[PDB]
Amino acid sequence: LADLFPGFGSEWINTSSGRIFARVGGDGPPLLLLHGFPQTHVMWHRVAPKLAERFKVIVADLPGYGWSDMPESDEQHTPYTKRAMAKQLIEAMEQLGHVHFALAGHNRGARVSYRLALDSPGRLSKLAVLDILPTYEYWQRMNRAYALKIYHWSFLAQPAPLPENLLGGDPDFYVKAKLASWTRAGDLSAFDPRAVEHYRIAFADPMRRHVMCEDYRAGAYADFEHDKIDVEAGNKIPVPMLALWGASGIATPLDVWRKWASDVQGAPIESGHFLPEEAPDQTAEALVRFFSA
Amino acid sequence: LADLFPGFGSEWINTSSGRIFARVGGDGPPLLLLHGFPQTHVMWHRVAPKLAERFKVIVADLPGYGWSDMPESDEQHTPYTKRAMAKQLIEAMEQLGHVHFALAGHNRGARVSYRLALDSPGRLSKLAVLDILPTYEYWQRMNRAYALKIYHWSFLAQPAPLPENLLGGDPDFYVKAKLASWTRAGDLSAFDPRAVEHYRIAFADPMRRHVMCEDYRAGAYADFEHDKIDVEAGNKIPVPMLALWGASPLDVWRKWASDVQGAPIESGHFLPEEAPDQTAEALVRFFSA
Ligand SMILES: [Ca+2]
Ligand SMILES: [Cl-]
Ligand SMILES: [Cl-]
Ligand SMILES: [Cl-]
Ligand SMILES: [Cl-]
């Protein structure tokens, strides 16, 4: 496996829930970056160097993904709820001495990030969420057209061991098909092949696949209920926020986020779902500008 | 593979789109019985005997399922649309001289049946559907709760080869998990083991699995659009109808049919195997007078 962050250090950070693996580089105000599914920290490799010119950049594997430890799950999928993931990432930031920091997330990592902002807002100076709406909004919109377009939320959420058994025959084919499908061109051309190999090796481990299904189970059940509480109570994030989305992505999104956040700006970018790999210069620039302003 | 139909013949019926396999027994008025997913005609083995006391009973494999031939599909999944399946079964019944008959179906076979009643109501004396609502109604109901409960409607409808590739690694597990999870018991104890082997053997074949996905792609697209036209026109099935459902709906069918009666049966989805006495008794009494 290639080193895609040349000159960045590496840290295995202890927490009460297990170790978090991270690459660490640059100098300046602290900025945590969080990937999602079906990827690892390496998806930030095209934008990290440029962010590292202006910030101390912490590129972490999510609890249970990549090289971070995989805690044993339970009947409510607790450790892979976004509430618990956020708590665990807060502890890992405190081990480095960061109690107030900037945060950007993508896909599941964006879900950890907004949940973090709702539960513990004093932790964040600013927040960016890339190509997502809140988990409550995804589910509230569900109808035949969305059910057919974005099927995997309900598939990976079926009780164990159904999705796990289906995915075990030919795991490479599933992970590569997902990566390609969500891009603008529908192929693997946007990704560095050494980044594709990181994703494929993680996806080849049955234990790593189980974590991803637990993540999506949490997505269908506890995460949804936690969001519902907040929207029914009218709670909005007060942290200044940016919503960036792909014109051809999965997530207008800015109008949805205005219901969830009192100080939000946003823009589309010409891209599929994978903004930091499909549109690196534009994504790096939008983030540097937002976090420096 | 076991003969589960004592005193029934075995027939291959020709049609313009391929052969339909059927077990045929009994005498008297004609009654066609249609299975669904993930099963074959064998799923009527416990109720067909009682029905054959009074009727001439035709127990057919759906187009592409079991031992029926598999017509070539196309980009709109045409031969696995319920409209096309019904036209093909209408042709099969004509090869036997049956142009007006009674019809009961379960799961996919019930969708063929109600679409047959909507398209060609003159073909049917009476109609029974087991544990379904119309395809349009399931889709209209597709919120978070339904997306989770009935996930396979969206998964099996994903463009080829995604579900076919996944089902290929351990098909025995997938079929047995479906059978089990929709029963009251949650295991395979309601089923005869010989019937389970018919279902496993059919599901073990990649070409039979592809047909199943074509059926669900039809269910997501043309079949939905067909139902939508009837709902927008206010069309109602005129044929006398019975809706049976597992306690583990009559109001829904009253919107789709002008002469409908209905009852729950103590059962999961697989009424003719979980609740064979009660299912047979209800069908016999409906179809008699
Ligand atoms: Ca320490
Ligand atoms: Cl979303
Ligand atoms: Cl770019
Ligand atoms: Cl069905
Ligand atoms: Cl019974």
Shortest Cα distance, chain A CAs vs residue B157, angstroms: 7
Total residues belonging to chain A: 293
Q: What are phi and psi of A146, to 5 degrees?
A: -75, -40
Q: Resolution limit in angstroms?
A: 1.8
> Is the Cα dihedral A18, A24, A29, A33 positive or negative?
negative
Looking at chain A, which residue has its C-alpha nearest residue B142?
A143
Cα–Cα dist A145/A132, whole Å = 18
Cα–Cα dist B49/B46, whole Å = 7
Cα–Cα dist B189/A11, whole Å = 53
Verify whether the Cβ–Cβ distance A167 to B166 is below 8 Å. yes
Interface of B with A in 110-129 (CB under 8 A): none
Task: Note whether A16 contacts B: Cβ–Cβ < 8 A.
Answer: no
Task: Note whether B28 contacts A: Cβ–Cβ < 8 A.
Answer: no
Q: Kind of pairing, strands A9-13 and A20-26?
A: antiparallel
Query: Domain containing B251: what range?
Result: 1-289
Which candidate, A27, A243, A17, places its Cα nearest to that of A117?
A243
Strand partners, B9: B24
Cβ proximity of B80 and B73 under 8 Å: yes
Q: What are phi and psi of B77, to 5 degrees?
A: 60, 30
Looking at chain B, which residue has its C-alpha nearest residue A150?
B154
What is the DSSP-derived secondary structure letter of residue B159?
P
Cβ proximity of A179 and A38 under 8 Å: yes
| Residue B59, C-beta contacts closer than 8 angstroms, at least 6 positions apart | B5, B8, B22, B23, B24, B33, B41, B44, B48
| Residue A139, C-beta contacts closer than 8 angstroms, at least 6 positions apart | A220, A224, B144
The SS3 assignment for B213 reads: helix
Which candidate, A241, A240, A265, places its Cα nearest to that of A255?
A265
Neighbours of B267 (CB within 10 A): 24
Task: Note whether B34 contacts A: Cβ–Cβ < 8 A.
Answer: no
**What's the gap between Cα B24 and its chain centre?**
17
Cβ proximity of B198 and B208 under 8 Å: no
Ion ligand 3: residue ranges with CB closer than 5 A: A 279, 281-282
Q: What are phi and psi of A59, to 5 degrees?
A: -105, 100
Here the tokens at position B116 are: 């047959």
**CATH value at residue A258:** 3.40.50.1820
- What are the strands, taking DSSP E only, across B2-123? 9-13, 20-25, 30-34, 56-60, 101-106
Report long-range pairs for B42-45 (Cβ below 8 Å, ≥24 apart). Answer: B42/B4, B42/B66, B42/B195, B42/B198, B42/B199, B43/B106, B43/B195, B43/B270, B43/B272, B43/B273, B44/B272, B45/B4, B45/B5, B45/B192, B45/B195
Helix, strand, coil abundance in chain A, percent, nearest 5? 45, 15, 35
Cβ proximity of B113 and B105 under 8 Å: yes
Cα–Cα dist A27/A55, whole Å = 5
Residue carrying structure tokens 């599914």: A37
Half-sphere exposure of residue B77: CA atoms within 13 angstroms, side-chain side: 23
Question: CA end-to-end span of chain A, whole Å?
Answer: 36
What is the DSSP-derived secondary structure letter of residue B237?
B
Strand partners, A31: A57, A102
DSSP letters for A35-76: --TT--GGGGTTTHHHHTTTSEEEEEPPTTSTTS------TT
Verify whether the Cβ–Cβ distance A169 to B174 is below 8 Å. no
Distances (CA, A) of A228 to A220, A223, B113, B187: 12, 9, 41, 34
The experimental technique used to determine this model is X-ray
Task: Note whether B177 contacts A: Cβ–Cβ < 8 A.
Answer: yes
Give which of B166, B216, B228 to mutate to test A binding, by max A Cβ within 10 Å. B166
Cα–Cα dist B119/B83, whole Å = 8
Cα–Cα dist A120/A117, whole Å = 5
Cα–Cα dist A210/A193, whole Å = 25
Name every chain B residue with its beta carbon within 8 A of the beta carbon of A165: 169-170, 173-174
The SS3 assignment for B77 reads: coil
User: Residue A284 CA: which ligand is closest?
Assistant: 3
Cα–Cα dist A36/A112, whole Å = 9
Task: Give per-residue burial for A104-137: e unless 16+ CB within 10 Å, then b.
Answer: bbbbbbbbbbbbbbbeeeebbebbbbbbbbbbbb
Cβ proximity of A293 and A269 under 8 Å: no
Cβ proximity of A293 and A54 under 8 Å: no
Cβ proximity of B18 and B68 under 8 Å: yes
User: How many angstroms separate the most distant Cα atoms in chain A?
Assistant: 49
Name every chain B residue with its beta carbon within 8 A of the beta carbon of A143: 142-143
> Is the Cα dihedral A246, A247, A249, A254 positive or negative?
positive
Cβ proximity of A290 and A242 under 8 Å: yes
Cα–Cα dist A179/A58, whole Å = 24
Verify whether the Cβ–Cβ distance A158 to B151 is below 8 Å. yes
Strand partners, B32: B58, B103
Strand order from edge to edge, sheet including A264-269: A9-13, A20-26, A56-60, A30-34, A101-106, A124-130, A241-246, A264-269
* Count: domains in chain A: 1
**What's the gap between Cα B288 and its chain centre?**
22
Give which of B137, B141, B142 to mutate to test A binding, by max A Cβ within 10 Å. B142
Strand order from edge to edge, sheet including B9-13: B9-13, B20-25, B56-60, B30-34, B101-106, B124-130, B241-246, B260-265
Q: What are phi and psi of B60, to 5 degrees?
A: -105, 140
Report the separation in Å between the CA atom of A16 and the middle of ligand 1, taken as the mean of its atom positions: 11
Question: CA end-to-end span of chain B, whole Å?
Answer: 37
Considering CB atoms only, which of A142, A168, A224 is closest to B143?
A142
Neighbours of B53 (CB within 10 A): 12
Here the tokens at position B99 are: 């142009």
